[PDB]
Amino acid sequence: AKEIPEVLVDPRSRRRYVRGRFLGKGGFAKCFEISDADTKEVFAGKIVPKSLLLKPHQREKMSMEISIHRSLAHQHVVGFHGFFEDNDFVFVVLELCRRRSLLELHKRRKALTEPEARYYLRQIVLGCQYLHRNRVIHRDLKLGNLFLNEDLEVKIGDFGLATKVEYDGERKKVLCGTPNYIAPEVLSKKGHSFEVDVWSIGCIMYTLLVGKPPFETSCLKETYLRIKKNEYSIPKHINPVAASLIQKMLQTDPTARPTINELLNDEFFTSGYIPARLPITCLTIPPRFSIAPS
Ligand SMILES: CC[C@@H]1c2c(C#N)ncn2-c2cnc(Nc3ccc(C(=O)NC4CCN(C)CC4)cc3OC)nc2N1C1CCCC1
Numbered sequence: 001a002k003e004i005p006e007v008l009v010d011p012r013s014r015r016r017y018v019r020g021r022f023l024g025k026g027g028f029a030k031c032f033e034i035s036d037a038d039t040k041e042v043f044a045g046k047i048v049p050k051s052l053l054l055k056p057h058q059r060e061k062m063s064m065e066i067s068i069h070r071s072l073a074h075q076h077v078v079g080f081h082g083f084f085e086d087n088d089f090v091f092v093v094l095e096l097c098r099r100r101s102l103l104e105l106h107k108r109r110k111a112l113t114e115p116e117a118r119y120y121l122r123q124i125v126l127g128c129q130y131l132h133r134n135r136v137i138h139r140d141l142k143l144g145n146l147f148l149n150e151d152l153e154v155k156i157g158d159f160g161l162a163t164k165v166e167y168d169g170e171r172k173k174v175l176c177g178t179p180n181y182i183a184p185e186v187l188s189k190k191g192h193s194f195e196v197d198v199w200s201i202g203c204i205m206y207t208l209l210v211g212k213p214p215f216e217t218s219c220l221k222e223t224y225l226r227i228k229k230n231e232y233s234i235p236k237h238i239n240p241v242a243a244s245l246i247q248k249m250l251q252t253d254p255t256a257r258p259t260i261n262e263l264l265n266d267e268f269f270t271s272g273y274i275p276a277r278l279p280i281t282c283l284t285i286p287p288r289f290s291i292a293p294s
């Protein structure tokens with residue numbers, strides 16, 4: 001069966017992590033709360049058996065994932081703390097985001113209030129500005145990959161579909177993986193780059209405000225059909241300034257979308273209330289954002 005060790009020891013760094021609470025699957029990975037022996041500091045551990053990494057291509061992807069992620073550090077990106085291996089497993093030590101992800105928020109709250117959406121989107125955007133500035137395209141921005149720490153700060157994670165732009169104007173021809181909010185240029189196999197992430201952020205904005213994803217259907221291929229056609233619609237109860245921004249991000253032509261750097265200067269942000277922080281009640285109850293308590 002090949003057992004996962006109770007203690008994970010990085011022979012090089014000489015750190016030892018005690019394996020704790022199981023967190024769930026993450027593709028080939030089993031994930032656990034792991035804690036450092038000396039410092040007692042608690043991380044999220046991504047354990048993937050080498051028995052599922054028999055093929056060089058599968059190994060290369062993981063190798064690249066780490067390559068990309070180890071080089072990144074930002075307030076709104078999941079902290080990369082390390083990786084190591086024994087002959088049976090690959091262990092990746094990541095920032096523990098104790099509030100899980102926006103997917104879990106979405107499932108509890110469905111559509112958010114506008115200022116919550118503004119709050120989360122700004123952090124999503126700041127993180128992605130950072131990525132793009134460092135030539136990295138995430139290519140699978142979704143709610144499940146947008147983790148939340150104890151202070152409800154967004155942390156972009158899971159760089160398994162990410163890719164590094166190596167030269168100016170490079171159109172990536174391939175994307176091994178199936179992103180959730182997949183851009184039409186990927187689906188048509190026309191070649192793609194950074195605008196893929198702005199697409200996804202468009203879908204995320206929609207989802208956060210509407211309470212459901214823009215192109216959802218019962219068949220994944222019928223959904224891809226709709227993306228190709230740009231066949232979505234924004235409910236009337238959505239404000240036009242928000243709606244306008246969604247429309248700019250969800251255009252079939254990638255060159256018509258705003259760049260990541262344009263986004264925070266949109267009316268949606270600059271003329272609406274953006275909370276400095278959200279209370280933990282926001283996991284469960286919609287916030288009214290009152291001006292003074294009782
Ligand atoms: C490390 C991989 C990935 C992750 C990546 C990646 N890739 N980057 C950061 N992270 C994560 C950071 N933080 C977390 N935090 C927590 C996730 C889940 C729970 C939880 O309560 N799970 C119950 C679910 C119901 N079940 C019945 C019992 C267990 C608690 C958490 O924090 C206290 N998770 C990250 N993930 C997740 C992706 C899915 C599996 C781990």
Ligand SMILES: [Zn+2]
Binds near residue numbers: 057176177
């Ligand atoms: Zn492939």
